[PDB]
């Protein structure tokens, strides 16, 4: 209604987080036709406290003709915790996978980095064009991979889940996230809407992805500790992993 600009949280964050945020937004802008997507005013920028430390959450969302919602979340808890979270939710008329990536860190280290193009079918197949493109990519040599949890059958075979040990690995990870985004943007630009029947299915796959993510994302615990259980529940179901209707 009346707005002030302040600098982005990403300036106070681990450099890989800043670089990824800038990179995600740069690819979005370059390939897609972005409009604002509005969250309730109260939720674009969130301040709280946790063990005396300042908690900050900065949310940025967009939409396109192909994407219902493109969400970039940055969070910071004093200097104990840095988080980047990113999800792209296609419109269910489009046979597109779900792009997601997460970075968790604190203290000049990163403990967890994940990136995927997660399938919208239960069989776990991606479209053909994605398969060729992703398989064509140089296979990357990560030293400290991590095992997906058993609720993680929502992820594709290309999913990357690592703890980056060096800045070489950090750069490898960032490079790969970028490749995923480029392939995904090309995918989106080439997609035609499907029949009202296939859209019913696309809508099941997304529903599956979002419920599994709600049930299991770990930011929940952080949010509960900051704001209580209901606030955290509401945030999980209406901001982070909202059901496609």
Swiss-Prot record:
Origin: domain of life: Bacteria
Outcome of swapping residue 73 to Q: Has 20% bilin reductase activity, only the two-electron reduction of the A ring occurs
InterPro entries in alphabetical order: Ferredoxin-dep_bilin_Rdtase, Ferredoxin_bilin_OxRdtase
GO BP: phytochromobilin biosynthetic process
Entry's Gene Ontology molecular function annotations: cobalt ion binding; phycocyanobilin:ferredoxin oxidoreductase activity
Reactions listed under catalytic activity: (2R,3Z)-phycocyanobilin + 4 oxidized [2Fe-2S]-[ferredoxin] = biliverdin IXalpha + 4 reduced [2Fe-2S]-[ferredoxin] + 4 H(+)
Documented EC number(s): 1.3.7.5
Keywords: Oxidoreductase
Primary role: Catalyzes the four-electron reduction of biliverdin IX-alpha (2-electron reduction at both the A and D rings); the reaction proceeds via an isolatable 2-electron intermediate, 181,182-dihydrobiliverdin. Upon overexpression in E.coli with PCB:ferredoxin oxidoreductase, CpeS and either CpcB or PecB permits synthesis of phycocyanin-coupled CpcB or PecB.
Similarity annotation: Belongs to the HY2 family.
Protein name: Phycocyanobilin:ferredoxin oxidoreductase
Gene name of this polypeptide: pcyA
């Amino acid at each position: 209604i009346s707005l002030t600009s302040i600098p982005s949280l990403r300036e106070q964050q681990h450099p890989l987080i800043r670089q990824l945020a800038d990179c995600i937004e740069e690819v979005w802008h370059q390939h897609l036709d972005l409009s604002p997507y509005h969250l309730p005013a109260e939720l674009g920028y969130v301040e709280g406290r946790l063990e005396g430390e300042k908690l900050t959450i900065e949310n940025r969302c967009y939409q396109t003709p192909q994407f219902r919602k493109m969400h970039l979340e940055l969070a910071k808890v004093g200097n104990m915790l840095d988080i980047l979270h990113c999800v792209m939710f296609p419109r269910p008329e489009y046979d597109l996978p779900m792009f997601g990536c997460d970075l968790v860190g604190g203290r000049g280290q990163i403990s967890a980095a994940i990136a995927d193009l997660s399938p919208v079918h239960l069989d776990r197949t991606l479209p053909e064009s994605y398969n060729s493109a992703l398989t064509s990519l140089n296979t990357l040599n990560f030293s400290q991979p991590r095992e997906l949890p058993e609720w993680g059958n929502i992820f594709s075979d290309f999913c990357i889940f690592v703890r980056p040990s060096s800045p070489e690995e950090e750069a490898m990870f960032l490079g790969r996230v970028r490749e995923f985004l480029q392939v995904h943007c090309q995918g989106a630009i080439a997609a035609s809407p499907v029949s009202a029947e296939q859209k019913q299915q696309i809508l099941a796959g997304q529903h599956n992805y979002c419920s599994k993510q709600q049930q299991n994302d770990k930011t929940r615990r952080v949010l509960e500790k900051a704001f209580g259980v209901d606030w955290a529940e509401n945030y999980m179901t209406t901001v982070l992993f909202d059901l496609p209707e």
